[PDB]
Symmetry: C3
Subunit: 293 residues, 3 copies
């Protein structure tokens, strides 16, 4: 048995197919079992149609053995492209080993595993090419995440499945040369989605475009929402944000990720370049959902 | 010497360049020596122009040592994209180790080897991503095969060459993220092409389009040829074929492959969904070439 | 620690980011430290804008530790896509191990390393797919090089960085399924660029287009410059060059590379096919820069 064949066979029982079918459509995806009580993690874009139109879509989970079981949507987070499903009263479940994405290094060999019984499912192999790489993702909203970049091929055949290290541990969730959501970030989102059915992210009310020159490189403020924390913090248009809190901002993509790293209700510093002068501002991030939270 | 360098050097002498040149055109490809009597296996699309227009095309085989030798087309099978060439009176030939594609597992490391002296020839490396994956291939006819999907790059530089395991054994023929024809299927086609110069595949006289919903997912009958076995079997238009013989049919691609698995002249069951009712039919497949057969 | 993680960590200190910024633009690239006196090698297309417009572009080098240091353009060679930078008075530099590209074999595992602190920098892994492969490269002029073809991904994230063997030795410079400039060729160009600030390549004054048929395959003369060595050597239009000196010419790409292998001022044979007759001609290559040379 090969080195990668052993690893792929080890986690095959913990990867499932996710089928969402209507009267005229259908779409498949991959998921991973992360809890013995029947909790399955995929990415939010696999089950987007069933979430926005639940009166016409049925979501089932197909196992490695061939068992087909109905599933229930616990919650989803479009801003991190994550979602949690639930299957009821299924015993002898093979739960996946969840690793620590903070221990992943550049050059580590990985497997991008899709569901074994998927239609066009794949299993690709590569290494970790970059860590903490902001990447944008296209009725769901557009988002930007820090991703574990890998030269293993991510496609519709292994999207939603796990990114696996050589210990058969899940270090990421494959998404959309290929990118995966870190498992440490996935644990935070999934733990909140199981508990409350929702996730609350900070907001500032800013639109930014990218800029890169000798004066200042970063995220240039393109808009300020009325009554937003940035409006009450003194942020103006044409400002060039270079630091959000404790993280330097290289472009609009890193800016979106840096805002999510902030704490809701706590004062945070913002460093901008206004008409050639470096100005330090202070904002209090609002929750994107005030009723949840 | 590296692990892959050792394997690539082991099979280099059994991979050849295939040159087809005319008064105004030329195209190169790769082949593999599978028999000491001078039998070379490539895919049918490398030598398509020389087969359809033999009065103007010359087909030569270039070896690893640099020897250029004229070749003769034994036979071809467009429906599996396979062809067999013949070189006469060449001694001390390095015949390739033919493996067993039924022993190949997902995750096995592979090499996609092209001819060493090819112009734009390549040698790519990857793993097996999927097994028994139906895949469509574009004056030759379009076909669909079960393929050994691999994340090793298949291109014009290694097409027609062998897919190689870590024992330097041929497990597939590279074709056209990359796909290869299984060696077990290649042995069946090549053994018949050497014996009779032809291959006879079953036919039903059906055109199908794909369909995927909650009622029924499979291959929807788009046409029925007059006097075809499907016409004498009771298959109608708008039927949704879900099982051809002993193989479930997920789409039109798997349907085309499932028909080739049938036996000519033997009754076979067909399961369709007609106006919401599951109906089991019986057909007797005809030979596509009645004079050969 | 993984096998590739160990190699990537070994050379990380010898790979640098190269930043060229103006009042309205900016572009990043990768380089490699090849000499303790502060000599950095990248490819010519990373610093093209700063070379052609030095009055408006500033070129800085960012190190692994985060140090940003101004850089000076020693010289560039568009015909091989190579350039040498210089940093002054920087001690404790980690100089990269330079290997021997003539000892590289097909199948050898390689790493394509980009600068660690680059914005969209990558580290991809693959094998060597082909050696001595002519490949064309797009106000700089178009060129063709022999390259170490690899199935590791080369992109804007690791372009200009080193191609690394399993001994953490530089065997190539990543450029532009992926290609790299051999380290042996890089040493020749860099040694001349450091010494004289320039590189002198042979010229013939010929334009060629590709041709591949049964009569003759090679580079067909499309133009002859007035007073060129080819004009004084008897080369005519519609000639089909098949051998430049001691190297056979398969197309226009190999022809461009074969000319650079010639010696300036020394008689060299040219074999053409003129109206069906093989004719052997003799040319004396001129220097492309007569004042340097």
């Amino acid at each position: 048995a090969g080195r990668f064949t052993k690893v792929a066979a080890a986690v095959a029982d913990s990867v499932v197919t996710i089928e969402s079918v209507s009267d005229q459509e259908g779409m498949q995806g991959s998921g991973v079992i992360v809890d013995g009580r029947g909790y399955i993690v995929t990415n939010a874009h696999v089950i987007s149609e069933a979430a926005n139109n639940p009166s016409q879509f049925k979501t089932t989970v197909v196992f490695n053995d061939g068992k087909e079981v109905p599933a229930n949507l616990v919650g989803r987070d479009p801003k991190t492209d994550l979602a949690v499903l639930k299957v009821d009263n299924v015993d002898n479940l093979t739960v996946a080993r969840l690793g620590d994405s903070s221990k992943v290094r550049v050059g580590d060999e990985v497997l991008a595993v899709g569901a074994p019984l998927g239609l066009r499912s794949t299993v690709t192999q590569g290494i970790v090419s970059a860590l903490h790489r902001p990447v944008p993702l296209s009725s769901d909203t557009d988002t930007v995440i820090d991703a574990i970049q890998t030269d293993a091929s991510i496609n519709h055949g292994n999207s939603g499945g796990p990114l696996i290290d050589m210990d058969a541990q899940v270090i990421g969730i494959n998404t959309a040369l290929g990118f995966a959501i870190p498992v440490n970030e996935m644990k935070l989102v999934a733990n909140s989605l199981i508990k409350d059915g929702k996730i609350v992210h900070p907001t500032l009310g800013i639109s930014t475009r990218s800029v890169s020159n000798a004066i200042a490189s970063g995220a240039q403020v393109a808009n300020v929402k009325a009554g937003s924390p940035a409006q009450k913090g003194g942020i103006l248009e044409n400002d060039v944000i270079v630091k959000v809190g404790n993280r330097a901002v290289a472009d609009s993509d890193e800016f979106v990720v840096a805002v999510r790293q902030l704490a809701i209700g706590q004062d945070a510093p913002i460093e901008v370049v206004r008409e050639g002068r470096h100005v330090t501002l202070t904002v209090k991030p609002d929750p994107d959902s005030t009723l949840e939270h």
